[PDB]
Point group: C3
Chain length 381, copies 3
């Protein structure tokens, strides 16, 4: 078909990439789209089975060229490119991949074979990012969420600004989106005919398990507790009682999570988020930074953590550690050793002053009622 | 058909309404009923696609007359009237509506066309309330819950007493009720044949989303967290981690809800119910009144609010504000300004004494351990 | 068929039970198994419609004999016996039961008729326990969980050690297990063809309601909040907001549960677990015993209970009662009366010292900030 060898294939990629203003995508994939039942141009959800991040640039070149080949004008100076796939695009791409078709393990190529076989018009779209800027489309928002939940990129590392304004608030029935106006328009007919769909939730975001397959040692005991865009390190457990992991939040190592992790909050390896505990996400103020809890921290049942914590910190059950809470310092000499740059000159510190320190133990003196910050005895050893 | 003009229609309504003891219903609609799999006279659920409250009295007259026309004796001195619809009732009503049949937007008339088209015996029932008293039927309980959840009537404004005794505890599978005795009777057959239905919950009440379509700016991130009979003002968000809205509870303006709103509790516009916070519903005692939180209140993560709060109150994360908790008053002069009738003569107040006041800030002194009630600095401005 | 009378039947049982080394099973039943989509020898779940505990030993003898009759070597010195049923086994058993076949109410016999009618190879397995030791199979783990959730045995009374290591972490879609590797292997095909299954959770354990039918006065308002192996006494209510009942945990009488009951924790009749409260399961240390809360205890919203409590204890909302928390004792003379062996000589006690006592009221002094242990005034009366 003119691409007969892998050498021909590589020269083709070189020709494409030497086109004027060509930029290699930083992320790309192909999404199956769910459209509005009433407004068929409204994209309600995008699903990917393969995410490419800073990889497989040849495959991206073939896809971009399929579009260029039929006259689609790609602005390589825009942050992203989204385009509906036609059958001709799939056939063009598969012909460029001719040298590989009888081989196993080429995942992007396998995906195209599948899409060709299941092709429908306006069902599939190529989605790519040229840079990390605010999303301009539902499709690019979904690619970004996937980049986070598949852990191709670290938590907080990509731009999600404006996502809420672009996404439609919809009903979700067995993880399928339905326009609210469709339900209103059909309510009499559906209820009287006993065909009213079962609505699990109404929101702009889907759940993690509608999109991501956990590692074999990762457990999520209830889907409603992990939003799409959450990032769970292998080995994490999310218990169902009073937990939550929001988008652009999660764990960077195996943790037991029984409480609530707000957006922008990161919990380090070996930490234990107790039943009904709260971890807030963003510190107050205009340059208010994100909250991180370090490694091997123990957050008690029904506690609240409103500041960044370093490693080996303990918040006792029931304690609220907020930015403005005052604490009486104990164990200053030992804490100095774990925290050599910090000035332990005084006796009372606000939560915010103590942010990020290691080996802290937040507790209440049960006789005097004083809030204390002390040494986690285990943190010295 | 003898009703040929809208004038004929209006004279018919006048004749009906001049019948002896006739009362216009205060609320009415037509429900599709779910009956027991074993006990077919047991009504397990009622679904409405249209609720009429203090409106469309002509339409109610036509329906009541359909029944009277065939000899049904309506007691207009009872608080409610419930009756199974026959095809003849639907045809009678549609014939009285003849002058309107080629016009759009007559919702009660459209509903009848649909019911005629999907008619089944014992499937549909007319349900109306003549006054606001204790429900006497499953059907009237469901009409009352709908009146609350559709916001046709305000929270706490209607009589729900006895509802629990009338409703059957059932299993619910994809929002369909199943008698527990049916599951017991069929368990061997169903499990061994691998046809055991998926049971989502066992209770007397259904969920809100099985019945109500939120406004486009209202989100409920998990159906199990909003019971049928809840009332959510447009713009409310219910997060899934540790929240709840019970029946005859909710919000009167757009609020962020991440905690638990008990029955009878009302949360005012702009308030923020923090993650895992509790709002209790009814004050203790025999004349113990319902708890209301006013506008723009901020309830901290893992707090407990056991008293009514006025506007612009703050409960810090972790604080329990109970009827018997004692608080040390600060900022008395400024609080007097926001609360001119209250007597700020003393220094220690019980929670219950402070009920309903504006601009309160409940906090703990972290050095002395004292519970404080102070000024919310933002409430002066 | 040679077993023609119930007398013949009883002599057959005598002959079987006199076989060398025969032991009567302590528990038995027949499970329908769910196997791996990829690994068909992996048992992902077992479902029973009938559990026998210390009963119906004749029926167990007939089943064991069906296997022995065809040469299966049963080790009656092992703790358990598991074996796949063949049609011949079912037909053999039904022939031994000939004298009963035209009679009603023989549940084990009815089950065999059903299994014969729905027979499939490798679908059904006989599962029995000869003693209470660590489970050796998925099948025996499931029998043990059933023994707990059906309340045939008391909470904590049976050996579940090693269960986590034997169970596979799987995806669950409408309560059906799916191997994660199957989802990975089929992800492209399933997502692009729009056939991706709805995954409710990923875990090693199923939910209670996938297996157990509550009593008519028992309510569970959300299935994800009660794990399989939980034990709920008749009349219990599990609310959905922030509750949980883990395996080998629950209630021994009717309780209102709105908080989290950890594994090994037992809550006594008439107790009320408030919204977002935590009950921990096992005391710290190597001989750290299980936590029990007695009858008519009141655990406040957002409290934490980390010690065993006797009867009529109160933990105020927001209070954390941990093993190491210190409390100032009040009402010593009255508490002595309720607790005659305890030595109320001193003024400050650690939580752990107070374990199991009756009539305790844990509260905070809101003026001094001191943690108090006092008399529950209602407990004297
Ligand atoms: Cl100081
Ligand atoms: Cl005073
Ligand atoms: Cl909680
Ligand atoms: Cl002492």
């Amino acid at each position: 078909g003119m691409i007969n060898t892998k050498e021909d294939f590589l020269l083709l990629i070189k020709q494409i990439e030497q086109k004027s203003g060509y930029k290699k995508p930083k992320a790309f994939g192909i999404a199956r789209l769910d459209r509005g039942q009433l407004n068929k141009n409204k994209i309600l959800q995008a699903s990917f089975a393969l995410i490419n991040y800073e990889q497989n640039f040849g495959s991206a070149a073939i896809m971009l060229e399929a579009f260029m080949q039929r006259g689609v004008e790609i602005d390589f100076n825009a942050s992203e490119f989204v385009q509906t796939l036609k059958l001709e695009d799939i056939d063009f791409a598969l012909s460029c991949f001719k040298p590989f078709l009888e081989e196993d393990g080429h995942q992007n190529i396998d995906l195209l074979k599948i899409i060709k076989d299941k092709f429908k018009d306006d069902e599939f779209s190529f989605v790519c990012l040229f840079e990390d800027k605010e999303p301009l489309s539902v499709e690019s928002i979904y690619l970004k969420l996937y980049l986070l939940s598949t852990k191709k990129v670290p938590l907080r590392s990509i731009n999600l600004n404006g996502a809420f304004g672009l996404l439609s608030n919809v009903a979700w029935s067995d993880d399928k989106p339905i326009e609210l106006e469709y339900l209103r328009a059909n309510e009499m007919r559906l209820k009287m005919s006993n065909q009213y769909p079962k609505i699990d939730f109404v929101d702009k975001f889907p759940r993690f398990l509608a999109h991501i397959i956990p590692e074999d040692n990762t457990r999520i005991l209830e889907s409603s507790k992990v939003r799409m865009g959450a990032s769970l390190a292998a080995g994490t457990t999310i218990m169902p009682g009073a937990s939550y992991v929001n988008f652009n939040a999660g764990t960077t190592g195996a943790c037991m999570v029984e409480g609530r992790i707000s957006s922008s909050a990161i919990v380090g390896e070996g930490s234990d988020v107790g039943g009904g505990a709260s971890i807030l996400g963003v510190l107050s103020g205009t340059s208010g930074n994100a909250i991180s809890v370090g490694k091997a921290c123990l957050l008690g049942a029904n506690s609240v953590t409103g500041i960044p914590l370093g490693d080996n910190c303990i918040v006792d059950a029931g304690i609220a550690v907020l930015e403005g809470t005052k604490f009486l310092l104990k164990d200053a000499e030992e804490l100095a050793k774990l925290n050599p740059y910090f000035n332990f000159d005084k006796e009372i510190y606000k939560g915010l002053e103590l942010k990020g320190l290691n080996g802290l133990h937040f507790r209440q003196d049960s006789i005097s009622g004083a809030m204390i910050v002390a040494l986690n005895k285990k943190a010295v050893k």
